[PDB]
Write an enzyme that holds these catalytic residues in place. Structure first.
Site, PDB file in Angstrom:
ATOM      1  N   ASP A   1       2.281  10.293  -2.287  1.00 49.68           N
ATOM      2  CA  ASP A   1       3.142   9.151  -2.009  1.00 49.68           C
ATOM      3  C   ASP A   1       4.603   9.564  -1.990  1.00 49.68           C
ATOM      4  O   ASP A   1       5.019  10.507  -2.675  1.00 49.68           O
ATOM      5  CB  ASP A   1       2.903   8.072  -3.119  1.00 49.68           C
ATOM      6  CG  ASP A   1       3.241   6.614  -2.799  1.00 49.68           C
ATOM      7  OD1 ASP A   1       4.163   6.376  -2.017  1.00 49.68           O
ATOM      8  OD2 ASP A   1       2.573   5.711  -3.349  1.00 49.68           O
TER       9      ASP A   1
ATOM     10  N   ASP B   1      -1.322   7.363  -0.157  1.00 47.51           N
ATOM     11  CA  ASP B   1      -0.445   6.425   0.535  1.00 47.51           C
ATOM     12  C   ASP B   1       0.050   7.191   1.749  1.00 47.51           C
ATOM     13  O   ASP B   1       0.753   8.199   1.607  1.00 47.51           O
ATOM     14  CB  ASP B   1       0.727   6.027  -0.375  1.00 47.51           C
ATOM     15  CG  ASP B   1       1.743   5.070   0.202  1.00 47.51           C
ATOM     16  OD1 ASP B   1       1.829   4.961   1.451  1.00 47.51           O
ATOM     17  OD2 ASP B   1       2.459   4.438  -0.585  1.00 47.51           O
TER      18      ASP B   1
ATOM     19  N   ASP C   1       2.482   6.860   3.620  1.00 46.04           N
ATOM     20  CA  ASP C   1       3.931   7.079   3.677  1.00 46.04           C
ATOM     21  C   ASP C   1       4.374   8.370   2.919  1.00 46.04           C
ATOM     22  O   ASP C   1       5.549   8.727   2.938  1.00 46.04           O
ATOM     23  CB  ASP C   1       4.707   5.802   3.223  1.00 46.04           C
ATOM     24  CG  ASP C   1       4.782   5.536   1.724  1.00 46.04           C
ATOM     25  OD1 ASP C   1       4.559   6.488   0.934  1.00 46.04           O
ATOM     26  OD2 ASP C   1       5.092   4.379   1.340  1.00 46.04           O
TER      27      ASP C   1
HETATM   28  N1  LIG Z   1      10.149   1.333  -5.536  1.00 51.25           N
HETATM   29  C1  LIG Z   1      10.109   0.198  -4.558  1.00 51.25           C
HETATM   30  C2  LIG Z   1       9.477  -1.007  -5.294  1.00 51.25           C
HETATM   31  O1  LIG Z   1       9.321  -2.056  -4.520  1.00 51.25           O
HETATM   32  O2  LIG Z   1       9.204  -1.009  -6.477  1.00 51.25           O
HETATM   33  C3  LIG Z   1      11.524  -0.060  -4.004  1.00 51.25           C
HETATM   34  C4  LIG Z   1      11.317  -0.625  -2.592  1.00 51.25           C
HETATM   35  C5  LIG Z   1      12.474  -0.153  -1.733  1.00 51.25           C
HETATM   36  N2  LIG Z   1      12.037   1.193  -1.242  1.00 51.25           N
HETATM   37  C6  LIG Z   1      10.558   1.137  -1.030  1.00 51.25           C
HETATM   38  C7  LIG Z   1      10.069   0.113  -2.045  1.00 51.25           C
HETATM   39  C8  LIG Z   1       9.322   0.671  -3.284  1.00 51.25           C
HETATM   40  C9  LIG Z   1       7.821   0.408  -3.318  1.00 51.25           C
HETATM   41  C10 LIG Z   1       6.947   1.244  -2.393  1.00 51.25           C
HETATM   42  C11 LIG Z   1       5.465   1.005  -2.669  1.00 51.25           C
HETATM   43  B1  LIG Z   1       4.569   1.950  -1.801  1.00 51.25           B
HETATM   44  O3  LIG Z   1       4.907   2.088  -0.387  1.00 51.25           O
HETATM   45  O4  LIG Z   1       4.387   3.355  -2.262  1.00 51.25           O
HETATM   46  O5  LIG Z   1       3.274   1.273  -1.770  1.00 51.25           O
HETATM   47 MN   LIG Z   2       2.261   3.752  -2.706  1.00 53.69          MN
HETATM   48 MN   LIG Z   3       4.721   4.739  -0.743  1.00 52.70          MN
END
Ligand SMILES: [NH3+][C@@]1(C(=O)O)C[C@H]2C[NH2+]C[C@H]2[C@@H]1CCC[B-](O)(O)O
Ligand SMILES: [Mn+2]
Ligand SMILES: [Mn+2]
Ligand SMILES: [NH3+][C@@]1(C(=O)O)C[C@H]2C[NH2+]C[C@H]2[C@@H]1CCC[B-](O)(O)O
Ligand SMILES: [NH3+][C@@]1(C(=O)O)C[C@H]2C[NH2+]C[C@H]2[C@@H]1CCC[B-](O)(O)O
Ligand SMILES: [Mn+2]
Ligand SMILES: [Mn+2]
Ligand SMILES: [Mn+2]
Ligand SMILES: [Mn+2]
Lengths: 317, 319, 318
Positions: free
Chosen positions: C122, C230, C232
């Site tokens: 991730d 993930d 991404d």
């Molecule tokens: N750390 C974040 C969060 O929402 O807690 C900040 C947000 C802004 N940048 C990306 C977002 C993050 C969550 C990503 C979750 B994922 O894509 O790994 O599922």
């Molecule tokens: Mn994730």
């Molecule tokens: Mn992610």
């Protein structure tokens, strides 16, 4: 220098595979200024011309193997032309054309230098036999016709009775593999052939790959190296204009590293620059990108170094 | 704030070191992209010193093939003075370019305060042509020749460079990313025995080993000030397309950030140059924002921004 | 081969985040020929279908945390579904869906194999607690609910009473990190969690990263491996169709290396393919590029090798 003394051979041939345009490889490579660029690089360049591959009527398939007589003949002519370049004390530079031509290029080089070692840069092993092939395309079989260990496994294919297997399983190193047929993987594994698939490249780094490749080939003492370069070994983001592209390929940098390293041994003796097909660029920009990359790769094989080059004169006086 | 994150911004809108107009708009687009505000979010102590007002020289006749000699020399003269001023205040000079000719001044001025500095030169090019070896006549490909003590005798007296006194030896400069070196330059590079990591060495070793060897070479004996001169063309044009002399097969976005993150970790970054950003050379506006966003990411990494994350010295779970 | 014995779980769920369309990840992943491609590479594949996540209309935020009951109930159902898949002696393959679902996938899997080790590929740490979060999106919080060391720091969120922390900070490894919030960075560093950010991947190379990852999780003893992927984590030039892309990611090659190395342990026990969003590319080719990349990662987890693959027969004498 002998490492910059070249004999160019145009090999405009497409019948080892079904996609038209690969026969234009020598044309677009010459149009990009290859020979002029080599000359500017202090190379002794002799142009043997483009071979006139005479068309064969009624070239019936051998089982499912396509154009056997045409493929067998193009390689036959080439073997003869390559051996001529080698007797003249030149490095053979084969401008392809599809990869079936490697039968003729390696065979002709082996008649002059039988102790040669092969470095095969490619997304594919090209090691299917006329029996294990499922496509019937001969550009996917050249290594099978060349190997000593496969003698007795290759059927009597029309157009190929001139072929004497000339390389042992120990004498080839694959770099770049990522699209190997089941039968092919069976062959590579049962023959114990040395290989660096994209997995090994990711694992070790091109630096170690080249170190091990060269120690494996040249450990004992010096010997001639044959570099067979299928441009699909490089990622399709660099060489898109190719018939069988596979994503996750070697980078433009990795391609330059391999060839810069081979140049420095001073043992490059034979070179194939294969599978450039200018009818397969999505845009003329994709054609030019591919041709530029194939030229860069070729120039590194003959001394062009990223760190720079200079004549042995004083540049400050 | 930490010395590592205490900064003095100097804008250098200068283009006469090369033939392509637009590089003088580099500090404008960088500031517009929010550079100074991003550094403040990163806990940086940022003082802007403004953009240097560069005067026109109408009768700037060439010295042989060497183009705009007086303009370039005075440009760097006005910058060495402004850089030496930032260093006396106890800040990290951050020179927004502008063409790489400005390195003469930026390094000259930093050397007036910290003569023991080491230089890390991130570029696809060595920029070591002398006014005599050059075939282009552009001074942006000539800064290092003016800076090296070992080339004292080989540099002629070009109008506008009288003030220049070579301040670094060949042992005090490390090149990273080389892939378009002229024959004259390659001879200079190999005769002087300069440490370098071309794309060949980067491919061979990996950026991890490049930074370990670069830092050990320059710092290993005694801790010293670092001057990072970053030509955005050191990175591949898929990342920094909006530049005058793009060369394929460059450093990646990741290598760029890896380079700058390791330099920050030393805690010795003393001078920085963000050079050759040309916003008028994008094929599209997307190419310009990309060159500008990457140049900003590289800059922020020089002052603490880490890909693993950053946090303030507080308890985040029970604040 | 048990490393090729699979149980497919579709988890069409998007309420762990704000961008609509991630719930189509299972649809689009199936349509790309996944099950067939797996059966072609000799796998014994069972499809348990897509979970019906019934509407939860009354779902007020817990402070800034959106859709808590919906995300909570979805992971709760998935945890029972994964535990069923693990009891049938099959590796669970959860086709997401947003990453909040990993609460359920890792929870259910732990019920059958409590000694499991986690590999989290991730660009994000996904470790915010309902209190440290600033976005209030539950896909950015799954790790916090699962860590035993954070027991005391997770408040009573509606829909999560069923959650029990199942993994210790020592039993998870991150790969690909490049966009970590300050609170997340504080947690990561305070708990001493093993990680390889893009900086470590650039420093060591993926080869060394995978060597250390498998030595860290398998050194004391061989145990089941849960890989939570993930998409991404890979750079947006390979996986653009995702809600939170970040430049300077893992390459297509690095993604295959990770998963090929994970396959060869013969210890893959659970697998999440998360955050594919076919409503979020710039073009339809960007959608097909993401999907194909996710398929390629998936096949590499179940033995597809770039060096080649062959059946135990004499190819020269058929
Ligand atoms: N750390 C974040 C969060 O929402 O807690 C900040 C947000 C802004 N940048 C990306 C977002 C993050 C969550 C990503 C979750 B994922 O894509 O790994 O599922
Ligand atoms: Mn994730
Ligand atoms: Mn992610
Ligand atoms: N192994 C193949 C073959 O035609 O024998 C299968 C085809 C499907 N993938 C590419 C094709 C292979 C031939 C490779 C020939 B070449 O590009 O490496 O010269
Ligand atoms: N060595 C050059 C020079 O102009 O001195 C040759 C030119 C053609 N390729 C690029 C040009 C070089 C100078 C580049 C300076 B720069 O962009 O690194 O600041
Ligand atoms: Mn090929
Ligand atoms: Mn080939
Ligand atoms: Mn420069
Ligand atoms: Mn440059």
């Amino acid at each position: 220098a002998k490492s910059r003394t070249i004999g160019i051979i145009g090999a405009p041939f497409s019948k080892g595979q079904p996609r038209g345009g690969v026969e234009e490889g020598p044309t677009v490579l010459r149009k990009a200024g290859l020979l002029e660029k080599l000359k500017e690089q202090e190379c002794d360049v002799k142009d043997y011309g483009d071979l006139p591959f005479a068309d064969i009527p009624n070239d019936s398939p051998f089982q499912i193997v396509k154009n056997p007589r045409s493929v067998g003949k193009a390689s036959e002519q080439l073997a003869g032309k390559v051996a001529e370049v080698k007797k003249n004390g030149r490095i053979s530079l084969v401008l392809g054309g599809d990869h079936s031509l490697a039968i003729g290029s390696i065979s002709g080089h082996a008649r002059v230098h039988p102790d040669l070692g092969v470095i095969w840069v490619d997304a594919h092993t090209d090691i299917n036999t006329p029996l294990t092939t499922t496509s019937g395309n001969l550009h996917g079989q050249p290594v099978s016709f060349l190997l000593k260990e496969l003698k007795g496994k290759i059927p009597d294919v029309p157009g190929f009775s001139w072929v004497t297997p000339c390389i042992s399983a120990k004498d080839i190193v694959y770099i770049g593999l990522r699209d190997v047929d089941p039968g092919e993987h069976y062959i590579l594994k049962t023959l114990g052939i040395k290989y660096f698939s994209m997995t090994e490249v990711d694992r070790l780094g091109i630096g170690k790959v080249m170190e091990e490749t060269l120690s494996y080939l040249l450990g004992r003492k010096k010997r001639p190296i044959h570099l067979s370069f299928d441009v699909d070994g490089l990622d399709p983001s660099f060489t898109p204009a190719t018939g069988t592209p596979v994503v996750g390929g070697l980078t433009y940098r990795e391609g330059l590293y391999i060839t810069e390293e081979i140049y420095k041994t001073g043992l490059l003796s034979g070179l194939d620059i294969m599978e450039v097909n200018p009818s397969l660029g999505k845009t003329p920009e994709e054609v030019t990108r591919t041709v530029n990359t194939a030229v860069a790769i070729t120039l590194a094989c003959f001394g062009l170094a990223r760190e720079g080059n200079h004549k042995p004169i004083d540049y400050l006086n």
